[PDB]
């Protein structure tokens, strides 16, 4: 009966992506002193359905100069990669109980850029090439910091399993002994998912649309849902990493309620962040992450290496 579990994992996150678009437009209007979409349905509840049907009855409009192989291969790979790393998340019991789920998340997150590169190179245009180059620079910036953030936060967990991450929260949150690393991790999740002020690929003022500027409707919606599943899942991962809740084996309802509310609040905070700051230049992206973030996280990494030896607090690996 794993098929039913897989379907119930993969369909409601797509529905969550659609209603994330709804509340995205609503809240993003609301801090701009205007209302959101509320004409189509009662408080605009039918906006995602109209958006989804509208993109799928348009014309795909494949370009002549585009190499059709990677042009048709990039969005499906993007949607699959945004979908395939949801499994090791404990919810409170994960789909697949992998001992090294952090490594799986890291490797499938490294794979997620390849759809952007193949969509940039497959379409023959200068804007797609510039978007691919900026995505490459964004990956250069964020990977070498994000790996060390995850390792140094994970050093008190004792193992790479995400199931044992819920055990460590039973006394106190790990955001209290690792609040600077929490700031580093939040900026890194801002940078990875390509959300403002770290967008730099789907630019409106710099480029037209960047990596998918030649992508018409149908294939374009896959990148949209992939990015929104990415941000929802990344906020769920941050919630599990730093603000893990109280788990009771006899009632999973408590933990589902708690992490759902916490991840929803973190996504609202992400929406709050994404439209209050100017967009960064991509030359200042590695003038910050390679210059200010890296020495600080090296110092904190060696501090978290030498800290359980200091206090005699070596965590168990099991």
């Amino acid at each position: 009966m794993f098929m039913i579990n897989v379907l119930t994992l993969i369909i409601p996150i797509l529905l969550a992506v659609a209603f994330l678009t709804l509340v995205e437009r609503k809240v993003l209007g609301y801090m701009q002193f205007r209302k959101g979409p509320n004409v189509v349905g009662p408080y605009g509840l039918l906006q995602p359905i109209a958006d989804a049907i509208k993109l799928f009855i348009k014309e795909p409009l494949r370009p002549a100069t585009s190499s059709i192989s990677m042009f048709i291969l990039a969005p499906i790979l993007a949607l699959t990669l945004a979908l395939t790393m949801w499994i090791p998340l404990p919810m409170p019991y994960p789909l697949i109980n992998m001992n090294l789920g952090v490594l799986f998340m890291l490797a499938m997150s490294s794979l997620a850029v390849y759809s952007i590169l193949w969509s940039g190179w497959a379409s023959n245009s200068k804007y797609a090439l510039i978007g691919a180059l900026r995505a490459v620079a964004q990956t250069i910036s964020y990977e070498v910091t994000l790996a060390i953030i995850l390792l140094s936060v994970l050093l008190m967990n004792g193992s790479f399993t995400l199931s044992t991450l819920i055990i460590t929260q039973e006394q106190v949150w790990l955001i209290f002994p690792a609040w600077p690393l929490a700031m580093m991790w939040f900026i890194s999740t801002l940078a990875e998912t390509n959300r403002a002020p770290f967008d730099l690929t789907e630019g409106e003022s710099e480029l037209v649309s960047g990596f998918n500027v030649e992508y018409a409707a149908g294939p374009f919606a896959l990148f949209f849902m992939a990015e929104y599943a990415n941000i929802i899942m990344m906020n769920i991962f941050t919630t599990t990493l730093f603000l893990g809740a109280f788990h009771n084996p006899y009632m999973p309802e408590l933990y589902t309620i708690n992490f759902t509310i916490k991840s929803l609040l973190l996504s609202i905070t992400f929406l709050w962040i994404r439209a209050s700051y100017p967009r960064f230049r991509y030359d200042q992206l590695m003038h910050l992450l390679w210059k200010n973030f890296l020495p600080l996280t090296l110092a904190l990494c060696m501090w978290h290496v030498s800290l359980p030896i200091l206090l005699s607090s070596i965590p168990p690996q099991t």
Binding site: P295, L296, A299, M302, L307, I309, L311, S312, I314
Partner: protein, 80 residues
């Protein structure tokens, strides 16, 4: 050295903070009192099987029962 420290704290505080954390992480475990406690905590974890030994009749330390007072105890971690 105060003027130079004030200058680097005014220009880039991140480097000063990083070097302070690095120096603390270098010099504090060499002054820690619980490092040997970590040593015995790691050494006392029973990973593999504690196989017994043959008897020639002359051993004052090893016991014949796990509950015998002879042999090493683990009271220090129980109290801590």
């Amino acid at each position: 050295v105060a003027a130079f420290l004030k200058n680097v704290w005014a220009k880039e505080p991140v480097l000063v903070a990083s070097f302070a954390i690095a120096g603390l992480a270098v010099i504090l475990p060499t002054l820690s009192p619980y490092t040997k406690y970590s040593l015995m905590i790691n050494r006392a974890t029973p990973y593999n099987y504690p196989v017994p030994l043959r008897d020639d009749g002359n051993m004052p330390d090893v016991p014949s029962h796990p509950q015998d007072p002879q042999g090493p105890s683990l009271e220090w971690l129980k109290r801590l």
